[PDB]
Design a protein around this ligand. Structure first.
Ligand SMILES: OC[C@H]1O[C@@H](O)[C@H](O)[C@@H](O)[C@H]1O
Ligand SMILES: OC[C@H]1O[C@@H](O)[C@H](O)[C@@H](O)[C@H]1O
Lengths: 518, 104, 104, 518
């Protein structure tokens, strides 16, 4: 429209209908010029990397992008409480995105003194990758999200991507992408941008914990009509061999026949937060579970979903097998345990093997009169028919969706870090300040212009997501576990601003409070 | 229109139909003042040329001009590969040119 | 029809439409009598096999069968190049089979 | 249809309408199996060739093809006389082709004794290359035409083709063609084949000779108003220099201004049929005009059209510059002049330079008081604006059409051997006996079958061509030259059968008898 008109309004609320929740978030952003308007080849060579496991090849772009892919972008802590205490499930449905009130600014420096002024004719350009033709970086859990607290102003992160490498080198199959080779909308102050998106059908996240365990599903009062082998010897001494059979029943539940078995396992090393209980060695990398791809070792960072500890063992956690969030102000490198927050998957204990335990035991031989029966431990167990499992829980600090990789086959493509896997996730939204040349020379020169006006932009972003709810139908008589604030006096309010103005999230909050039968 | 409105959008893609290819290229340009707004007689004398084979007479203008007359203006290397591997022939048909978002 | 009429024509080409390829292959075959018109029990015993991993039991028939189940049956090397350089994917859709000009 | 019915009738006549001639020719053919049903790589290595100028790479095919591309296929000698004496021009219009009364036969040999029997269920397969997707060999002047005499039974020639080579080797750009990869019609006895073809617009062949020469086009009674430089010196002695100018007129015709000049020239070496007049050396190849392509030398066999000798010099002929036909029964290699027939282009003497002469003279310097005027001979002259020329004459023994090569550019693409150049000439008609296996073994073997029943086919071919005529409009008072038979007694009739049954063509017959003004 024009210089003097606002191109959009602040809309931050949430709206609870019967089976639907509509979250709306507005934030203020700032976009720098990245890479001096250049595309740059980057690799572990350009960054000085060494180990082959860390080698990479790729490109950094002048562009930047929006990430709303964490839940605290869309939910206040109160809204999150309201979701998790009342609902068995939820999934995203629709998306609405807006860019408005764009302001492009010019920075001039004289001597040690900078002046900022509006550049009214400068433009910002924006496009969504709707055909998913770019490397999709939103499914890796990155910084640069919209801030959880609506009054914070955030920097837009720089877009970059990786392609195939051999060491620091690239192969011929490596692909380079110019983001200028897409059509994009150009925006002066007074222009706005919007688009809508439909989430594809995704199952409801399970926001409940089971009130039954998979090995306890029997009627405790009644025998089975099945028999098991109770006794193989008639007693001490030579040549005592029998087959004795007993009814499996209430008194021996471990031996009863069952129709369903716990889900798959890939075993994690167990680490105690009580520190003297740990070995006196460096096992962090060496003792870690990992998978290998093309000679590279990638740590298996989230487990396949697994229970983080056994009952009462809460001090234990799987080495890499859980999500670790930092507290507010926690540094980058080598921080103590009290400065991070270790998620635990304890609720899926009912259907899922413990991350730090063997799946079970198998027979390793044929017994005989000569040979005793031998068993061995199953350290990793793939899918078996009859397995049943829960996915990893999702968190207010955590990711929402991932892009399912485009491949011939996948199994149960729920993202291992948690959330909703999608073949066509919310598309990437790319934004860039268009370069404005400084004064060119008065004689022609064929070289590309390397001299530009120093410039940055700011504005507002609205994200509106419609969420579908699955209500609790339970007949449970006794009251349930719910997420609560604690009444006891404290210097600060949890999930509130500091005395210095710093918003913090004191604890990770999962979704699983309400219960269901198994 | 106005100071605060963009007068055009960035369109750079290529579009492959059955017997047609449509290339679109968007670039950012800068235009200096040339010749201090003057027309100037120029010759090999003004440039110091000597040999008769190189002698010339003409004019330089304050104006400047657009040249999209090379193929890499319209074709990405991948698009060029896609053209040359699959086709016995090609020719240009239509042209559309735009100037927009002018900033003085 | 009759002794003096051809019951079919040779059709070997390939046809590239926009999203479809139609391959057609014609070959000349010869069919012997197998097993002297007999069904025969066969096993690794009848062939002299030994190891249990190789043991088998079955039947050989007087019949014979057609196998077009390799790609070079339907694609010339040039057609294969044309498929693999230009396309992210392909799948079979329809099939048409003919036997004609039989000569006993 | 059936075994007992004829699938077509013999139609050999010609039909003269007002401006149209329709020729119809029927012949009997025999088709062997070629290459034992195999495609074979062939090269100068496989044939033992040596010189790089003769090196080639290609394939021979089991297929064979029809060639009606000579005029004696469609015209009796009387019809040819009737064409050339009455018409200024003619061109082909339509084509109709038929294969019918196919007979496939089986050959069995016992000991030194062969038995031929019908194989009623065997088939012949036929297709036209209508999209011109095969190497086109009909535009090279080859044996294997339909015989000029309708009672002769002819063998179908074997189809083969060449692709790119380096020496005897092939490069990656070389292309291989399987003729089985085309659709073709299969024919038992009782099946027939036909197709129609439209000639594209081609200019009329010029069946006239000019009654004027390009340098005589002036009015002999009247002066020009132009002047020429008659005299550059005033006389003998020193310092005699003048410019004298005269009117060009009837008495000096060589110097008059003219609007049009003779056509282009590429000079041929002159050879006398009076043999003692020739040099005593081997000049056949060494003294020959040639063009070079990729390091190979190809003799320039037909000239660009040029006059074969000057007036009264008929004993002279251009080395390669004319078409040479063999007489009946003339051998393959090193035959005397009396056993061949040397065509002469003498009629185009009016507009075309003599093949064995220089085109003319050009100035090679600047004359001056110090330097005399110098000229040099033009041995080859390309097209100049204002040039005018006739194409090579066409012959009853000669070719009709050629395929214009498919290229970015060509100039005046009249075939140099004569006839009608066409971008889409009459298509190639390919024919093959379909292989019939002998008895296969009773155990399966994956090898292709190399054992076949010995087999060949015969039948009839009809070719019908409609020809458009251009009548003579001339106002010439005196009678003209016409082609005639000579009345004088001879042992044989010309263009008739021998006492042994051998048809022969005693002389080459061109088209140019009638005259036109220039
Ligand atoms: O390969 C050895 C290294 O492996 C890395 O992945 C690990 O983070 C480092 O601590 C080091 O142990
Ligand atoms: O290169 C020398 C040879 O060239 C051939 O083209 C010619 O026919 C031979 O006679 C021989 O002279």
């Amino acid at each position: 429209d024009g210089v003097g008109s606002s191109s959009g309004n602040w809309h931050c609320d949430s709206q609870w209908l019967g089976d639907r929740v509509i979250t709306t978030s507005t934030r203020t952003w700032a976009l720098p010029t990245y890479n001096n308007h250049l595309y740059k080849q980057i690799s572990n060579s350009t960054s000085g990397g060494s180990s082959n496991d860390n080698a990479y090849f790729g490109y950094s772009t002048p562009w930047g992008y929006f990430d709303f892919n964490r839940f605290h972008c869309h939910f206040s802590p109160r809204d999150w409480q309201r979701l998790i205490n009342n609902n068995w499930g939820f999934r995203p449905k629709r998306l609405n995105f807006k860019l408005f009130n764009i302001q492009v600014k010019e920075v001039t420096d004289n001597n040690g003194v900078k002046t900022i002024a509006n550049n009214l004719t400068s433009t910002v350009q924006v496009f969504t990758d709707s055909d998913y033709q770019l490397p999709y970086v939103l499914g890796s859990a990155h910084e640069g999200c919209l801030p959880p607290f609506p009054a914070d102003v955030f920097m837009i992160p720089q877009y970059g991507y990786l392609t195939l490498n051999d060491g620091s080198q690239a192969v011929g199959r490596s692909s380079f992408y110019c983001l200028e080779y897409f059509p994009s909308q150009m925006l002066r102050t007074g222009n706005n941008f919007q688009f809508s998106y439909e989430f594809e059908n995704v199952p409801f996240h399970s926001s409940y914990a089971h009130s039954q365990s998979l090995d306890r599903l029997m009627n405790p009062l009644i025998d089975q009509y099945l028999y098991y082998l109770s006794k193989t010897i008639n007693g001490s001494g030579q040549n005592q061999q029998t087959l004795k059979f007993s009814v499996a029943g209430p008194s021996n539940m471990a031996v009863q026949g069952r129709n369903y078995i716990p889900g798959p396992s890939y075993r994690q090393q167990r680490v105690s937060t009580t520190v003297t209980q740990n070995n006196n060695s460096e096992f962090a990398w060496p003792g870690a579970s990992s998978w290998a791809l093309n000679g590279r070792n990638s740590l298996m960072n989230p487990g396949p979903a697994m229970a983080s500890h056994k009952e009462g063992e809460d001090r234990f956690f799987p080495l890499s097998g859980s999500l670790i969030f930092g507290k507010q102000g926690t540094g980058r490198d080598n921080v103590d345990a009290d400065k991070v927050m270790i998620t635990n998957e304890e609720e899926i204990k009912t259907t899922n093997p413990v991350a730090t335990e063997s799946y079970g035991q198998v027979a390793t031989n044929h017994q005989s009169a000569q040979a005793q029966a031998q068993t061995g431990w199953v350290q990793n167990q793939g899918i078996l028919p009859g397995m049943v499992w829960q996915d990893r829980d999702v968190y207010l600090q955590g990711p929402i969706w991932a892009k399912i990789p485009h491949t011939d086959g996948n199994f149960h493509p729920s993202p291992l870090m948690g959330g909703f896997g999608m073949k066509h996730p919310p598309p990437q939204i790319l934004i860039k300040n268009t370069p404005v040349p400084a004064d060119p020379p008065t004689a022609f020169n064929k070289d590309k212009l390397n001299s530009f006006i120093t410039q940055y932009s700011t504005g507002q972003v609205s994200v509106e997501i419609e969420w579908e709810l699955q209500k609790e139908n339970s007949k449970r008589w006794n009251p349930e576990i719910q997420y609560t604030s604690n009444y006891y006096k404290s210097n600060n309010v949890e999930f509130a601003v500091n005395t210095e103005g710093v918003y913090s999230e004191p604890r990770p909050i999962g979704t699983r409070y309400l219960t269901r039968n198994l």
